[PDB]
Swiss-Prot record, chain A:
Miscellaneous information on this protein: Most abundant protein in virion. When expressed alone can form virus-like particles in transfected cells.
A Gene Ontology biological process term: viral budding from plasma membrane
One cellular component (GO) term of this entry: virion membrane
Localisation: Virion membrane; Host nucleus
GO terms of molecular function: RNA binding; structural constituent of virion
Role: Plays critical roles in virus replication, from virus entry and uncoating to assembly and budding of the virus particle. M1 binding to ribonucleocapsids (RNPs) in nucleus seems to inhibit viral transcription. Interaction of viral NEP with M1-RNP is thought to promote nuclear export of the complex, which is targeted to the virion assembly site at the apical plasma membrane in polarized epithelial cells. Interactions with NA and HA may bring M1, a non-raft-associated protein, into lipid rafts. Forms a continuous shell on the inner side of the lipid bilayer in virion, where it binds the RNP. Determines the virion's shape: spherical or filamentous. Clinical isolates of influenza are characterized by the presence of significant proportion of filamentous virions, whereas after multiple passage on eggs or cell culture, virions have only spherical morphology. Filamentous virions are thought to be important to infect neighboring cells, and spherical virions more suited to spread through aerosol between hosts organisms.
Keywords, sorted A to Z: Host nucleus, Membrane, RNA-binding, Viral matrix protein, Virion
Superkingdom, natural source: Viruses
Variant or mutagenesis effect after changing C148S: 31% loss of RNA binding activity
SS bond partners: none
Originating species: Influenza A virus (strain A/Wilson-Smith/1933 H1N1) (Influenza A virus (strain A/WS/1933 H1N1))
Span of the entire protein shown here: 2 to 158 of 252
Record motif Nuclear localization signal, residues: 101-105
Topological relation to the membrane, as annotated: Peripheral membrane protein
Protein name: Matrix protein 1
Length: 158, 132
């Protein structure tokens, strides 16, 4: 019943603001409906938004890179990589690698999200970083699963 | 003297250059990639008092590589139980540049994790590995 829409709800659940929620929702939905979209425009826009924590930008950046055709432009942006590089925390990095290996064996959104839902926001974000480094390591659905668990954990944290 | 070979090690990777570390202040812009993080990591050991974490935190990442991160964390644990220069450097030598670099990012965030000597070993082991 549409994973894109589920992913959007999870993404928006970590966007504080109110005005940004609407702005993010519009962009995700345009992307979903194939409407006029351009990845460089989205990223630049995302990068310059106020209020959104670096982490949220990393997550939205990852989701746009995953959902936006507009590639053939070997992406990998600084702000996305930095916000998802973990943060010098050994424990989150160790867990991120362990989750990452489990996700490579998953093939569905549901299986990926359930496994990832037990991990901490920190390791989930580091894990998103590993996958950002090579989006093909897992399937799109699995990547979506991970994004959603990450959002749940950030939302449930504070 | 330890700051001597560390200084040559620190300049073991540099691309003409102009030394900068003689033994406070700030940045250094213009060019210089990963080395920037390394150098910065160095300064953070030879410039503050008895903060920032600019491009230090970014260059000393694991570059989205699963194996480097994996290794970097296992090295990190070891370098914590280590206590001398050469020893830490010895061990760090059995790991790759990527791993070594990722290990430096960890140490950074919590410098107090490893002694200045050990960290220096990591540095040299890293540069030696890099330059090589």
């Amino acid at each position: 019943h549409s994973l894109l829409t589920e992913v959007e709800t999870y993404v928006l659940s970590i966007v504080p603001s109110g005005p940004l929620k609407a702005e993010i929702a519009q962009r995700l939905e345009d992307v979903f409906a194939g409407k006029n979209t351009d990845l460089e425009v989205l990223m630049e826009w995302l990068k310059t938004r106020p209020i959104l924590s670096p982490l949220t930008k990393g997550i939205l950046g990852f989701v746009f890179t995953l959902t936006v055709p507009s590639e053939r432009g070997l992406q990998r942006r600084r702000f996305v990589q930095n916000a998802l590089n973990g943060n010098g925390d050994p424990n989150n990095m160790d867990k991120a690698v362990k989750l990452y290996r489990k996700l490579k064996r998953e093939i569905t959104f549901h299986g990926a999200k359930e496994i990832a839902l037990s991990y901490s926001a920190g390791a989930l974000a580091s894990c998103m970083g590993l996958i950002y480094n090579r989006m093909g390591a897992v399937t799109t659905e699995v990547a979506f699963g991970l994004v959603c668990a990450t959002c749940e954990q950030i939302a449930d944290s504070q």
